[PDB]
Amino acid sequence: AVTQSPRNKVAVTGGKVTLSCQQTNNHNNMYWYRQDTGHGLRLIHYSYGAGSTEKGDIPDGYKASRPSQEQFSLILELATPSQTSVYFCASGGGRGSYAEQFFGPGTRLTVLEDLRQVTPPKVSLFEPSKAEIANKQKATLVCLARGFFPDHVELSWWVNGKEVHSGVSTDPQAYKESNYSYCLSSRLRVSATFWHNPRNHFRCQVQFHGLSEEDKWPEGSPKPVTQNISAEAWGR
Amino acid sequence: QQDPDPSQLHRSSLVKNLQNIYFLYEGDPVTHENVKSVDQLLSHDLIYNVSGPNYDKLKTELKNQEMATLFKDKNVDIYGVEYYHLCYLSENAERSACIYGGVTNHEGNHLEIPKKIVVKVSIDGIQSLSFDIETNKKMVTAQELDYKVRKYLTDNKQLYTNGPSKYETGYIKFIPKNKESFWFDFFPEPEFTQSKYLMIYKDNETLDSNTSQIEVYLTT
Ligand SMILES: [Zn+2]
Ligand SMILES: [Zn+2]
Ligand SMILES: [Zn+2]
């Protein structure tokens, strides 16, 4: 397996950031990549083994270290907004071609001028269209999260307490509304019969990752740290 | 080793992955007291059942078979700069570390008190730096002294960094009592591997800690 830590991170320009990769595949090769919307997966640094690292295709602005076989770290001494991106780690057996690689879950890193912009989301649940119910035989619930920044969020659905992916349709990526505000919507379709049973519970769960304990927030104002907001509704 | 000429020194600005040299001298060296060979792969090496953070076995390639069979059954002290990439110790197993030389006899090679050796550092033709190195061995390998010189220089003068170097060229010169002096270039060739570079310690050159001088020459 390959894990990455932290999975979410907001940093201020000029700050120092460290992404850590851990593997249990006992592979000699490890890699650090970055991916940017519409753009490709680019290699930053890689390593053929403990105690050494190699410059990738876009090394400028990053340092790397391989303290052991299991770990591979990517260091950003002076974070810049241009380093905002989604970082991927991977281990590789054999020669290290893609077919022999195993990627991590990814890390979302956002670098801004200051943290006073970070804001938790607004979550709302909406009942199926009046008409849609009748000659639709299908009931569709729409979940909307907005006014959040940056865009490190996860949206899931829970019917009767059990997570569901069937009938779900979530926007592939959070879309920006204003300069400092994102929006994200999703839909859950069920049989109009299911939506009419007062025994059925509907829940839209949203998780927002903001600032961390390690971060220092200007005292006097509530610190926008991670949050778990949920909108619910019963069957009518 | 006849002293070097400017054109004979490797330039750091030409080394693409110079951080791989930094890792060797910034990190802890592999040190082991009174231990003896357990296995052997090639005629000129010895394997030990010693351990460290990243290894359960250590291999040391010496100058040749004669020297290998000389230390094979003795109780030695190990002090070297190890690498892990390309350190094949068998067909299947691993968790092995590799070095070159760094071997001395343990029995009766220690000092009541550590012997301090002065390192005269010269930067741009001007010997303006001087600091002390230490060892508790009578007969010490050049490697040990070298590692200690570079570790201090890296920690205090930034000889190496996880990146480029403030110095363009550099080398360490050893001046034994009644023997020919020799030197090591601080920088590798544009393309190198840790194992290839570390061959400077394969000869297991040892010195009399009591009567040996150390000079360092750098250019920014
Ligand atoms: Zn999360
Ligand atoms: Zn000893
Ligand atoms: Zn050369």
Curated annotation (Swiss-Prot), chain A:
It is found in: Membrane. GO terms for cellular component: alpha-beta T cell receptor complex. Keywords: Glycoprotein, Immunoglobulin domain, Membrane, Receptor, Transmembrane, Transmembrane helix. Its main location: membrane. Glycans are attached at residues 179, 228. It is a single-pass membrane protein. It comes from the Eukaryota. Residues 113-236 are annotated as: C region. Clone B10.A was isolated from a cytotoxic T lymphocyte. This is T-cell receptor beta-2 chain C region. The chain holds residues 1 to 124 of 173 of the full protein.
From Swiss-Prot, chain B:
GO terms for cellular component: extracellular region. Pfam families: Stap_Strp_tox_C, Stap_Strp_toxin. One of its GO terms (molecular function) is toxin activity. It comes from the Bacteria. InterPro entries: Enterotoxin, Staph/Strept_toxin_CS, Staph_tox_OB, SuperAg_toxin_C, Superantigen_bac, Toxin_b-grasp_Staph/Strep. Disulfide bonds join 87-98. Keywords: Disulfide bond, Signal, Toxin, Virulence. Causative agent of the symptoms associated with scarlet fever, have been associated with streptococcal toxic shock-like disease and may play a role in the early events of rheumatic fever. Belongs to the staphylococcal/streptococcal toxin family. Binds to major histocompatibility complex class II beta chain. This toxin is coded by bacteriophage T12. This is Exotoxin type A. It comes from Streptococcus pyogenes. The gene is speA.
